[PDB]
Design a protein around this ligand. Structure first.
Ligand SMILES: Nc1nc2c(ncn2[C@@H]2O[C@H](COP(=O)(O)OP(=O)(O)O)[C@@H](O)[C@H]2O)c(=O)[nH]1
Ligand SMILES: Nc1nc2c(ncn2[C@@H]2O[C@H](COP(=O)(O)OP(=O)(O)O)[C@@H](O)[C@H]2O)c(=O)[nH]1
Lengths: 419, 419
């Protein structure tokens, strides 16, 4: 019974174009949610030329009729949150009254300045994601409910945790009193936004009809359990993280959309079976503009991998796909798709869990004919050339998951919706 | 599509009688699973007088027709696992051929001796649960797939992690070479049991009809996110942990049974709104034999709390309840049940997330008449006295969840199944 949430999840290693899909769906949502992760990825939404940037906040908050909801599974750096919101207010009127439309689950953990600093030091041996999730598991971390209740109690616990980090990282510059004093100011602005998230969501699920959207962060292959460990993030980026990060049961999960780029990218090091460190990869990188916006560094590129897609589907149970950046392939005379894995000369049915073993797999490819035409103006599936249509159908046939959206360009209008 | 798993979850703070329900359901299961947690709780299953004890292993493995499955969310101390299995083999023939009927997900994390040792030290400032889940989040932990692949690689990483703990805990006695040498022996016995768990489960879900049972560990109010934090365990003991700990989607979750004791217990310190630290609590403790079997220490006891039960249901979406130890109440002339919470003189709709605030709530009670008769021989709901029937109906009416089982004694036969 009750409303069933719509979830948008990245199917690969991020940068698939989830924001493009969320943009469309958030236009008629009532509630938009974050369930897991922190603020490590930035996205830009343009309204009347004005470029707003989101990191922790659900991009859907740009719709004036939505309530944005931060779940218990999310980790929150308070200076970062206020900086992000305040900078948006400086850019234009799009976030007018945001404080009235943001609800923060009081069970969310707080990322401290020292967690971010420790993150940098550990990397030497910087959003503080590893450290805050480690403190959470250790039960030493502090939560929003602690900050907004007895500040003496909060302060005592904060000092213990800060001193732990200081004693483990002697080179760590840690301003215990200064951080704590800024938190006093941060606590007073956040208080009205902090509430019981389990009760909030339960009431929204069981009241009148509502469209509730959950914006997944990161992607399936970056999942702490299921991704290419240890080259993963520290949270569950998969569907089960919706349930654990929002405190709602499986029967309230509705549509789960997998955002699948028409070819593959990876940002960091880590196994990448279909990687094309060559002219094919250069062509993908150039046409897909595959580089960090806040770094400039090029992403590793490769062919679509349907073996890893099927794996993400085993875990996530996608109800439909959004296949993005199909237009990148407009210049390809032939396109390869990974369809099977061999290990030591033998076909294997699984994804090797160990990184070094995954590194040894030989991908078996299907070669499909290119269309060699510009599809950027296509607005319906009938307008796509046959070989582009067949590329889409091949993915549908191999995965047995229907494609609901096809991305044919950067703009909002550059999308085909099939049903 | 496919098979849908049955889940048994503790609804309160543990010791509800989950093993009693699992005993019944495991008799016709094909696959029994652990999804989260480690070996911190022991249970005894009696077959032909022989007492077998389970800690990490699913108790259902006692059925010769089952395959026991350890999911990716579980944390595994290898000496403990082999000790547990080997001791059972010493007791009798009930575990004959267990190595042929145990499958271990290769994405499960390993609990090292130094994690257990650190656990003890941290408590001074001991199953190693906190430490292993902290290493998992930090991405420094090692997994079953690492152990069974390149042992040189495994050894290198093991030494880094061991040395981290040694440098943080100077008083920690850590035998790096000795642990590693025992792991060489442990690796060779475990190798045939270790496989890709995502693929294993996916095939079992989508092949012929199968009865797949998931034995939850711990309980809802001990959940890392949802429990009385920090007085919780370090894993998700709630329904979302089935999905994250087994790598299967919400559409493959079927029946989710909440095991609810007819009154409440807590083992450790932590908020306990209906606690009866008095003659009522003593009577519950005595009749329910509420003490640790491996410690002898008495559990804190209190009235049934329907406010916290409704909260666990918001998160878990129970499809039915098993109401255990109803016979304990046979001696009570009146029984109180917590039905609402007041905070600072005002009724509140939520469960305070902060422990100290939860400590301040005043429970509002409903008083129900006792039956004052021995129900231990009852085998059908019609055989229960009216006031016992009405106690059951009150819970059903308040929670709007049907009761499927009523426990009226310790034995297998001391159960009523309503549907
Ligand atoms: N050419 C092209 N660019 C796209 C398409 N979809 C997304 N993009 C661009 O790719 C980048 C990444 O998309 P975004 O929505 O931010 O990805 P996210 O990090 O997964 O949310 C953005 O610059 C988008 O404008 C597409 O279908 N075609
Ligand atoms: N008198 C009585 N004892 C019960 C009942 N259900 C369980 N027990 C006992 O309570 C203890 C805890 O039950 P167990 O199944 O091990 O709990 P678990 O830790 O939640 O799995 C065991 O000694 C059981 O025999 C009941 O309905 N009545």
């Amino acid at each position: 019974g009750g409303n069933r949430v719509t979830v948008v999840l990245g199917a690969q290693w991020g940068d698939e174009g989830k924001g493009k899909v969320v943009d469309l769906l958030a236009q008629d949502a009532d509630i938009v949610c974050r369930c897991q992760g922190g603020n490590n990825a930035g996205h830009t939404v343009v309204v009347d030329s004005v470029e707003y940037d989101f990191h922790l906040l659900p991009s859907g908050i740009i719709n004036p009729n939505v309530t944005a909801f931060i779940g218990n599974g999310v980790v929150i750096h308070l200076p970062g949150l206020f900086e992000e919101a305040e900078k948006n207010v400086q850019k234009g009127k799009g976030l007018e009254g945001w404080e009235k439309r943001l609800i923060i689950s009081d069970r969310a953990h707080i990322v401290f300045d020292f967690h971010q600093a420790a993150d940098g030091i550990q990397e030497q041996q910087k959003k503080g994601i590893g450290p805050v999730y480690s403190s959470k598991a250790a039960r030493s971390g502090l939560r929003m409910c602690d900050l907004v209740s007895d500040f003496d109690g909060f302060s005592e616990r904060f000092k213990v945790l800060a001193n732990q980090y200081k004693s483990i990282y002697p080179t760590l510059e840690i301003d215990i009193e200064g951080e704590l004093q800024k938190l006093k100011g941060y606590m007073e602005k956040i208080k009205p936004m902090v509430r019981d998230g389990v009760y909030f969501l339960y009431e929204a699920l069981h009241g009148p009809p509502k469209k509730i959207l959950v914006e997944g962060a990161n992607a399936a292959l970056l999942d702490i359990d299921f991704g290419t460990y240890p080259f993963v993030t520290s949270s569950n980026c998969t569907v089960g993280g919706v349930c654990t990060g929002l405190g709602m049961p499986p029967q309230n999960v509705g549509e789960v959309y997998g955002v699948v780029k028409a070819y593959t990218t990876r940002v960091g090091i880590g196994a990448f079976p279909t990687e094309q460190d060559n002219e094919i990869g250069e062509l993908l990188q150039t046409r897909g503009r595959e580089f960090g916006v806040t770094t400039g560094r090029k992403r590793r590129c490769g062919w679509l991998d349907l073996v890893l897609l099927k794996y993400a589907h085993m875990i996530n149970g996608f109800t439909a796909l959004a296949l993005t950046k199909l237009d990148i392939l407009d210049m390809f005379t032939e396109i390869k798709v990974g369809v099977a894995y061999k290990l030591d000369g033998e076909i294997i049915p699984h994804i090797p869990a160990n990184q070094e073993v995954l590194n040894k797999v030989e991908v078996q490819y299907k070669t499909l004919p290119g269309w060699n035409t510009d599809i950027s103006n296509a607005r319906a599936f009938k307008e796509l050339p046959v070989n582009a249509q067949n590329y889409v159908r091949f993915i549908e046939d191999e995965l047995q998951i229907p494609v609901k959206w096809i991305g044919v360009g950067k703009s909002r209008e550059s999308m085909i919706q099939l049903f």
